[model samples]
Target: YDIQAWKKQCEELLNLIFQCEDSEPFRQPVDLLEYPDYRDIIDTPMDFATVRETLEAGNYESPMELCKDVRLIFSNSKAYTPSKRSRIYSMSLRLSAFFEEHISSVLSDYKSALRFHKR
Candidate 1:
């Protein structure tokens, strides 16, 4: 498994997750974030650095687990004060969903590559 190829695949998947319509799992609020096209965001140099770092860290497992925890935390925030909870919960849910959809694939591919590397 070529690490670069896997990284590229992971990046593509992440782009898809970010670009997905609101109807998808992330349900990102376009209006609030002034959301740009996924391609545009991914194409930017700064964003490339983030992808590089994520791949290099090999923290795919942790991010997958973190995404799950984030979902649970956001889901349970409803019991808190409505106004504050709404903001925090929404943010958490959106971020979690984003990572769950995007980073999970990246992490998986990286892990697979690492496993092959070890062999």
Candidate 2:
């Protein structure tokens, strides 16, 4: 797999996520003042900000690695949020669905690009 192409694909998807209306809560790290126990509850908290930084830093080895971290952003929220009726819980669900849907299309493009490469 081409690392450059994968990184570019990830960045595009991340930009879409950043612009999502339901992305507010996952945009940045949780405020310690507002949720003191957040760190205690979430073993490895992740947010869009951190994901963007890591992606730009060239940290991810593959698209799946990036996908795992992005998924964590939602799972962390779902784990912390107590009720399905809560806005955060529902927002997480919606954002996740959006990511999964778009990532599939982007991945297909990436794979097609890979097949066109000269050996």
**Residue 107 displacement (Å), model 2:** 3.8
The C-alpha local distance difference test score for the whole of candidate 2 amounts to: 0.85
Which stretches of candidate 2 lie above 4 Å from their native place? 1-3, 108-119
Best by lDDT: 2
The alpha-carbon deviation from the true structure for residue 26 of candidate 1, after best TM-score superposition, in angstroms, is 13
TM-scores for candidates 1 onward, in order: 0.38, 0.85
Tell me the lDDT of candidate 1: 0.47
lDDT of 2 by residue, 1-119 (tens): 45257788789888988988899999888899999989988999899989989999989776677889989998998889878889888999999999998778666766666676743
- Candidate 1: tens digits of C-alpha lDDT, residues 4-41: 55545554655664464422433332232443443343
